[PDB]
């Protein structure tokens, strides 16, 4: 398929989200 | 709080669906945990107590939305897109063979919700496999994450 980017590449996107709302958390 | 705009609640309220398990208005101790345990960790009952009682500045047990932007609003952190590059490998190379199995894929439909077919599990792979050898290796893994 073309531009297959879209399918692989969304799911990466949110991973990155995750971990962004517990590192609140923690605070490093 | 550098969000005026209304947009941005209207964006914020999908966001809090994501981490709502019982849409209670609330986020509790259960749905907070049960989250953290899909990034592959096995943390402990005393790990929901001690998170949780850091961010609740009310002490009533849960955090509610003013608690939320506060940190929203803080959360600015600079994540360098390659911390999640490698690191995404690993988590994909279950056994760590140097290679992505297909089996170890199957799992990660799960954590992003696409509940994707027999059909779509192929399809993935076959657009990353430049070769007939039935796995994906390294290389075929960047070819597909090169995103922008
Ligand atoms: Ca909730
Ligand atoms: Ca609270
Ligand atoms: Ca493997
Ligand atoms: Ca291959």
Redesign the pocket.
């Known amino acids: 398929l073309r531009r297959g980017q879209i399918l692989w590449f969304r799911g990466l996107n949110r991973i990155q989200t995750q971990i962004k709302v517990v590192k609140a958390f923690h605070s490093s | 709080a550098d969000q005026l705009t209304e947009e941005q609640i209207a964006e914020f309220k999908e966001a809090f669906s994501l981490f709502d398990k019982d849409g209670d208005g609330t986020i509790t101790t259960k749905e907070l945990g049960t989250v953290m345990r899909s990034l592959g960790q096995n943390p402990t009952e005393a790990e929901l107590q001690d998170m949780i009682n850091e961010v609740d500045a009310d002490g009533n047990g849960t955090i509610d939305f003013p608690e939320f932007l506060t940190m929203m609003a803080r959360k600015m952190k600079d994540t360098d897109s390659e911390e999640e590059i490698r690191e995404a490998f690993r988590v994909?190379?279950?056994?760590?063979?140097?290679?992505?199995?297909a089996?170890?894929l199957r799992h990660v439909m799960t954590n992003l919700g696409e509940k994707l077919t027999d059909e779509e599990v192929d399809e993935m792979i076959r657009e990353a496999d430049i070769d007939g050898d039935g796995?994906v290796n390294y290389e075929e893994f960047v070819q597909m994450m090169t995103a922008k």
């Open positions: 994909f190379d279950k056994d760590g063979n140097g290679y992505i199995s089996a170890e796995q």
